[PDB]
Design a protein around this ligand. Structure first.
Ligand code: HEM
Ligand code: HEM
Ligand SMILES: Cc1cc(N)nc(C[C@H]2CNC[C@H]2NCCNCc2ccc(Cl)cc2)c1
Ligand SMILES: Cc1cc(N)nc(C[C@H]2CNC[C@H]2NCCNCc2ccc(Cl)cc2)c1
Ligand SMILES: C[C@H](O)[C@H](O)[C@H]1CNc2nc(N)[nH]c(=O)c2N1
Ligand SMILES: C[C@H](O)[C@H](O)[C@H]1CNc2nc(N)[nH]c(=O)c2N1
Ligand SMILES: C[As](C)(=O)[O-]
Ligand SMILES: C[As](C)(=O)[O-]
Ligand SMILES: [Zn+2]
Lengths: 405, 402
């Protein structure tokens, strides 16, 4: 039949063909010889120009003026700017379109039904670490909006030839410190040990709790990073309690409201925005299953199972599964109680199936990473588990970048 | 060239060099990954045979010996004259074990070296196929102390139909289309249930009616055989603490025996070679009983648990699912029938990955299939990167014979 990937949904028995993959101009890690789909990790004016032209064509197609005078003029304008300077700059509306496309294009995001609704803060005039901090605080305030979260991204100046990058050292705007102990264990989040020590190496006076909010290490071009402490009033947190298990609250667990990724690179038409933090709202399993139950994270499964009085001596009691469910329920219940936006893994995957149907119609497909889209608990209980998916790289895109240190 | 493989829970890293031995292409390309898809969209025979024979002699540490060389001549002489060849029983046994070892979707591979191989290549009729199958079941079932086994029927031959078992598993429950478009029994087996009736089977009207086997000998219409009830071990499902669970009248058979896959060894193809092991509880508790397109009992169990099925945020689905999987383990354990839970199973697979890293420099594995359908990240395999590729001997899918 059609010479494109045939995609099947095994619950519904429905079929679609992905034609959008034909627009991919960047190769992933697989080959006919072996699939590396489960791996977490994957200028020449000549190449830049082709990427820039592709992006401008995308922009004009999106506003239905492809082939028009303005379209051709913009293309000539970009070529001229690159011709004389080596780079070029995006117009305001082009940046807005590009940022939304990058989210729309992210294969690992299950929240893409929301892609068209993104507040894009243009911070390309930012010229100091102190100002980066101002922009970040405004982002957090706007995005947090007292618990009624709003998706947002703040874009700082793009990488420039012969100049240092703007960089936020932290992986997220909000994260808990991880303190290496005497005995070799860790108090707080084990994932943040290195960033926590870098903050200390940089003058931060460390706390000693399990949930100490880390300061931000912000770096303006060609300068050492500066340290900034987030005012507590700005970081909304949710104390965790369980709807029926009264002792859960005594565990003293909590989590912050805003998931804000700050170390990814936003690439649009060949231009690279090394500092462009973006945020949305949590899907409950990110907190309840990964952050709280991963063995290499807070690892609280055994503690909660002991509290629930489960037989933690044998795997067949399914004590891990039982505790995980209650921990996830507590996260949902607590966020709901505190009126902070959150979406459970069932609702999220149901909305992602709608997004796939929308994109099939709008673009002929949707790049999706099955392993990342299917939730960490109750996998086959959600509709995405039964949906085959095609994964490929489209641009604009969010890409990982090496840590600045 | 060789992929770096990292385990994110432990921080350990390995390099897969075994993938360089793959000679068959998967579905992916540098442009797009199709790893989530369930199914794929004489000089050669001789090279595959040589490689296999090479594999065999290396396995018994007699590579290069006289026996190795003579065997290679034998194979070449037979292919040159007849266009095919035949395997010795010892080689067939080594071949079947390697095909299991190479199966990327199997989480139970730590057991790969323990497999009873039944040579059924001297089978000339559907009736004989049935006798072999019955003996396989009796042996594999062993009154509840399941033993892994495979029965190999005659290889495919040029200009001649295949020996085939039409059923996808030796034991399966009927799926009957009701007037109102619904289905009584297993919805996954509607088509096969209908073929059986069409081929003279007197259907039942229950929810767990064991289907009869449609066995096909070369170029003949398939024949119907009803398995003797006393041969099909089943486990009534009850819950350790919820008394009403047993009232649901749920049950499942003890023996998972795949019968529609093709076994390929040294270029030869065995279109009928049913194999069986023992269940991992989530196959029954999560997929068979809870899939929307299967028995779909989540809502019923949820209501019996008087859960709030009004909203997803109450996690009623997750809660019911866990109790159903608990009932399966409890029941099989009560009935003293072999079964392995998903935590124990994945822990053994991690050991297997380590054993194979030392033994062969890698292990082909399909992450999406190895990670259980519930509590994925609560198991060690979730945090383990895997490389997937096709090695031979191999088990592969083949067209339905109708
Ligand atoms: C509105 C709510 C949103 C929800 C519920 C959501 C949910 C998720 C989830 C569950 C993941 C996988 C995260 C992980 O396991 O580490 C993810 C990844 C991702 N999301 Fe979304 N997302 C949302 C908004 C956004 C926004 C506003 C952007 C960008 C404009 C975005 C960009 C991404 C990207 C690039 C990734 C992958 C990053 C990586 O590989 O680490 N998401 N999202
Ligand atoms: C002894 C205990 C065994 C257990 C616990 C086990 C477990 C599993 C599981 C959970 C799967 C994925 C099943 C699914 O979701 O459909 C699977 C697939 C598979 N297993 Fe094993 N296995 C065992 C024995 C065997 C044996 C004896 C063979 C062959 C000699 C075998 C060959 C395979 C193959 C080829 C697949 C993939 C089939 C497909 O893609 O449909 N297994 N096994
Ligand atoms: C806007 C938004 C909204 C929501 N709900 N969720 C996210 C995802 C974000 C919050 N939970 C996990 C974080 N992602 C980290 C993934 N690390 C991959 C990774 C990459 C590279 C390395 Cl070395 C390790 C790990 C972003
Ligand atoms: C020896 C053994 C031991 C255990 N424990 N489990 C198995 C697996 C077997 C029992 N439950 C699921 C069955 N697999 C069928 C896969 N269907 C995919 C599929 C392939 C092709 C189509 Cl058209 C649809 C679906 C085999
Ligand atoms: C090794 C494996 O790729 C890794 O653990 C992946 C699997 N799926 C995931 N899915 C999501 N959403 N987030 C993750 O961090 C991961 N980790
Ligand atoms: C579409 C998707 O590949 C499909 O639902 C897969 C996912 N993982 C699986 N894993 C196992 N063990 N068994 C299955 O049948 C599946 N189905
Ligand atoms: C229940 As708590 C210790
Ligand atoms: C069967 As009802 C509880
Ligand atoms: Zn792939």
């Amino acid at each position: 039949g059609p010479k494109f990937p045939r995609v099947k949904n095994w619950e519904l028995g429905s079929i679609t063909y992905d034609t959008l993959c034909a627009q991919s101009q960047q190769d992933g890690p697989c080959t006919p010889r072996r699939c590396l789909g489960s791996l977490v990790l994957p200028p020449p004016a000549e190449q830049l120009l082709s990427q820039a032209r592709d992006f401008i064509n995308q922009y004009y197609s999106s506003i239905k003026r492809s082939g028009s005078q303005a379209h051709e003029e913009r293309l000539q304008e970009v070529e001229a700017e690159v011709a004389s300077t080596g780079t070029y700059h995006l117009r305001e509306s082009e940046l807005v379109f590009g940022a939304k496309q990058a989210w729309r294009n992210a294969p690992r995001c299950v929240g893409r039904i929301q892609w068209g609704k993104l507040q894009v803060f243009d911070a390309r005039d930012c010229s100091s670490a102190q100002e980066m901090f101002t922009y970040i605080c405004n982002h957090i305030k706007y995005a947090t909006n007292r618990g009624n979260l709003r998706s947002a991204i703040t874009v700082f100046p793009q990488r420039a030839p012969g100049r240092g990058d703007f960089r936020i050292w932290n992986s997220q705007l909000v994260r808990y410190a991880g303190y290496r102990q005497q005995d070799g264990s860790v108090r707080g989040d084990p994932a943040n040990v290195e960033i926590t020590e870098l903050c200390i190496q940089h003058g931060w006076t460390p706390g000693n709790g399990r949930f100490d909010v880390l300061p931000l290490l912000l770096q303006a071009p060609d300068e050492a990073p500066e340290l900034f402490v987030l005012p507590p009033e700005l970081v909304l947190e949710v104390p965790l309690e369980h709807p029926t298990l009264e002792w859960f609250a005594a565990l003293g667990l909590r989590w912050y409201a805003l998931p804000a990724v700050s170390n990814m690179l936003l690439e649009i038409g060949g231009l690279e925005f090394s500092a462009a933090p973006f945020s949305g709202w949590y899907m409950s399993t990110e907190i309840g299953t990964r952050n709280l139950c991963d063995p290499h994270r807070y690892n609280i499964l055994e503690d909660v199972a002991v509290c629930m009085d489960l037989d933690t001596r044998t795997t067949s009691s399914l004590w891990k599964d039982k505790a995980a469910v209650e921990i996830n329920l507590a996260v949902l219940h607590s966020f709901q109680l505190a009126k902070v936006t959150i979406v459970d893994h069932h609702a999220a995957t149901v909305s992602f199936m709608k997004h796939l149907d929308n994109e099939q119609k709008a673009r002929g497909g949707c790049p999706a990473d099955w392993a990342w889209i299917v939730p960490p608990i109750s996998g086959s209980l959600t509709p995405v588990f039964h949906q085959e998916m095609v994964n490929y790289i489209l641009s604009p895109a969010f890409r990982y970048q090496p840590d600045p240190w």
